[PDB]
Symmetry: D3
Subunit: 179 residues, 6 copies
């Protein structure tokens, strides 16, 4: 009756537009936590190799799968840091296309649907431009001292983000059948 | 063998007087976490709509049930913040009667039984009066900017608190039988 | 060279009244009500707040301003980061928050930090999320309630009103402090 | 107006010796041993503590006091919240903590913040939980152990003894610093 | 499919030399959390009775058992605090022999294998001497105000630590068979 | 006695240039770029950093030093604990970090706190873990990138080079500030 956060937590009734999101990393963290797929526990993947910190809460969507064999990642904008392992309701407001070490790794940019400040945003264009620059720079830089290259491209609108999410929902459901 | 914190964690040998308490919210937090009953995970219910913070650690008693269909809530006084999802041993020292949006929602005021500073308190009357005022004001105010009203009444002695706990223990055991 | 009294010896700045130096007294998230000690220029604990509330933003005063209550003009400064009490920064007014505290007028400026890349581009409080304004209003209405003190907060007024209030404080300081 | 040396230029306050201004040097929870630099009035890092220990409460000194060790009288201030080094607050003595540090006497006041709603009503250290007193004693016994320095802490003495010690420091300051 | 952190999390392929470590206590904490063996949850065992804090992250090795019937404890040196309940990969660099209330209770001193600063240490002798003194003093003192005595002896080299770990791995496997 | 301007009125210390007083402006882990206001001696917010980066260590300046850019000599101080802006500590140089910021030279000292038991025993930057040096270099290369400002950081130079740079700043201060 205790849930594995990727398999057992539901994506939520309003998916793909509104979805449960499991936080892995807190805003301001230098610790890169990640879900351990096997156990469903949080593990330290690494300490970041630069004096950088995550600009926002970061995690993944339960019952999603991508071509890299992991759930779909999400950056969640909100007033407050959230603890790793806790889940929240998020609305997608953009897609951030990236290439990490030659491999495609697009990520959702979302807001917390239960944050009174942020829940009213629907589109990444409504954010201050500096914010977007800060996010882009973070992803370009956070693995630089590991001699890894991350290319970050122009963000794409919510309708693209939501298609990405629906596609990962499909890929997950297709993986669950075989098992 | 991994526990759901409401169903699988025992209430403890000394219940109802002394009980295990699962912390949901840390002292000083603006994040209102709560137990997700289905999964047993911690979720963000909301960010508080006012510039207020929880005055003390806050959570629930495992294997308890109230008329609102949730476990019985507890405010736990102690020297240190405790992380959401962690449990501790608590002694009830009072009952705080409230009405939230017309619905009865009484809460226990407790101390941590393993805090050397606080474990020796047996009654809410032993606390400084200002503390009680601060607690009362918090519950009156924390949902005000959501246009919700919470009436908070005079606190009741430990013997009342312990009856409330025993009653929730009964209501839980009665719910578990049907299933 | 001389170490500065932050009220008297810190300049208000070239862009005033529009953009001005601001001395932080209280950090965002604080339950400690620090204030300028006018005699020494040190920061003092006035009180610990009597409720489980915290300052929603950094808060301080404008140097070389005076109000009828004998104090510099108060400012709430929105920006990404907490700032330490006693440090100063450059701020731009985006509104005025009219209040009455224990029957006395006590208007406060709402501003943004002019050197924060995120917030320096705001010019008007109406550009902020509505919730933000509600949180700020509620704070000032609630923060002295458990001291049985009443604060009424009225609708916020535009930047041109803010700027006029700042200019007036500047004149009252010159009249009462600097020139006699 | 003049910016203040916090030892010399900050007044001890109208209620002294009972209630007095206190300058915080070290914040509750800190492993950094800050101290007043007597020459400049700035705060300096004296050392990082040599053990995994932290100050149990805010700690500082009383302005315009002097002890035989050539320093102001030290004070441990109990209250709800951490206070920043360099800020001052109003405190009430509730006891005296007699100690010997490397063979020299070094009594310290134990006090509460007079403007903290929770703690301002305490008048005597015996009103605190026994554990609190044990933690404080252990801290002072342990905090220099890894520097091979010995501190013996004796049983705490009542407020009337505290107040007498404060009055004496006030007199020694007037004698040695103010009047010559 | 959700893991009990002692039973269900693997010790890791490189054990005993490199092992998964479940953090119980964060660097800087006055809260002594510990694993609840029954549930696999984190619980508050006590608030420390002195004004002391853990000098480093602290936890236990999954699928290990000692003569005191608990998993083997580990102090993990790294740049950053880690949250209770999260696991990480650690390399043993020493054994710290202790006697707690007359009972033998040796503990591993390790580094995080994924911390770029610390992963390159192989031996406790490579640490500044003051660090070792600080650690030793912490264990000698942290239970003093509870009138408990902890004797801490000279640290022993990595090869001893690794034998201790292998032995606890054996004791665990021998306990698992009966069940 | 006089309250001190931290650049002018704080002594560099008896052990200089080897060991020197250092005034912290920015705390380890901070995204706020504080700096000394040379006119007042107060700490001011220069900017909030334009990237999601943080200072890797405590950072400040040496009192009674001058560089061609009209500012005291900058210092990065390694130690166990964050230190508050405006406080001073004793530091030992272990290297020099040569940089060019927007085409202008801007060498900075790398040092350790002389009163931190862990770090006071280091004498040379080569004794630090290689990763530590890479993190520091990357910080200075990256921290102004989103302001479209370029900083090139070159290989670090030994303590004897650091010490010479400090001595030179001391002489330039005496020449330009103290003696005229």
């Amino acid at each position: 009756v205790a849930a594995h956060p990727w398999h057992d937590l539901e994506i939520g009734p309003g998916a793909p537009n509104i979805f449960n999101c499991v936080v892995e990393i807190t805003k301001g963290s230098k610790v890169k936590y990640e879900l351990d797929k096997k156990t469903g526990m949080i593990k330290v993947d690494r300490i970041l190799y630069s004096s950088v910190v995550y600009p926002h809460n970061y995690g993944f969507i339960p019952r999603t799968l991508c071509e890299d064999n992991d759930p779909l990642d999400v950056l969640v904008l909100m007033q407050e840091p959230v603890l790793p392992g806790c889940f929240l309701r998020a609305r997608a407001i953009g897609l951030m296309p990236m290439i990490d070490q030659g491999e495609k790794d697009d990520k959702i940019i979302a807001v917390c649907a239960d944050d009174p400040e942020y829940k009213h945003y629907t589109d990444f264009k409504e954010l201050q431009p500096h914010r977007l620059m800060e996010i882009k720079r973070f992803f370009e830089d956070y693995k630089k001292n590991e001699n890894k290259e991350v290319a970050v491209n122009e963000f794409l609108p919510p309708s693209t983000a939501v298609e990405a999410i629906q596609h990962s929902m499909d890929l997950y459901a297709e993986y669950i059948l075989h098992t």
